[model samples]
Target: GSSGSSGVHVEDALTYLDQVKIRFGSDPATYNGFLEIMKEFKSQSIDTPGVIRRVSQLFHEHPDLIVGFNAFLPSGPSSG
Candidate 1:
């Protein structure tokens, strides 16, 4: 159930999600960009948790953020 790719922890997802938000917020339009990326490309729906969010969830315990990004990529190699 757990692995190195879990990144941070269940409680830390929010922080990383916030980080994702902040990074994307820097562009503001990336929300639509992401949608376009998703629309233009046939992205695979991955089902797993990674590192960054692990820490975010560890601190924040936000399951939505945890599960949301986990579906995308491995949080980080630290999770490995």
Candidate 2:
């Protein structure tokens, strides 16, 4: 099985944020919160228990949003 940080590509993280943007666009504040979370994660500033808990909650809420996983995977021939 594929293991290690190599399994979690940076592209996957950015793509997940885009999906979040698509899902939460109707509410700007909630969408902006995801941006802030990404920023904090990237900057390694997510140190508090509350922030960690909230981040885990987001992950728990969106278990099906594994962005980019389908884009590069092989299934069948393209339609075009």
Candidate 3:
């Protein structure tokens, strides 16, 4: 299980996920699902486009939520 350093800090990622959970007031089971997704990418270093796409997919049901998510993101073309 010794994967080489990918520079992805699991703790920070989890913390961000927690922030996201709170942002959405997600149910415990929903939060668990988010965590599972994060766990899958925890080994990668840098933000993958798939991450953004996945997040978009996760919150697609809530357009307003997606708006807030976009606002929470930095301002730039590559912000996501």
Model 3 ranges off by over 4 Å: 1-19, 23-26, 74-80
Give RMSD to native, each candidate.
Answer: 12.4, 11.8, 12.0
Better of 1 and 3 by TM-score: 3
Order of quality (TM-score)? 3, 2, 1
Residues 1-80 of candidate 2 have per-residue lDDT tens digits of 77524355534535555766787667666666656775775687775443545555554555454323334333336653
Which residue ranges in model 1 land beyond 4 Å of their true spot? 1-10, 32-46, 49-80
Among the numbered candidates, top TM-score falls to 3
Error of 1 at 62 (Å): 24
Q: List ranges where model 2 is wrong by over 4 Å.
A: 1-10, 47-52, 56-80
Write model 3 residue lDDT over 1-80, tens digit each, in one string. 89444443424434444666786684665556666665657867436455566666777675665565554444456636
Best candidate, lDDT-wise? 3
Error of 2 at 12 (Å): 2.7
The lDDT values for all models are 0.46, 0.54, 0.57
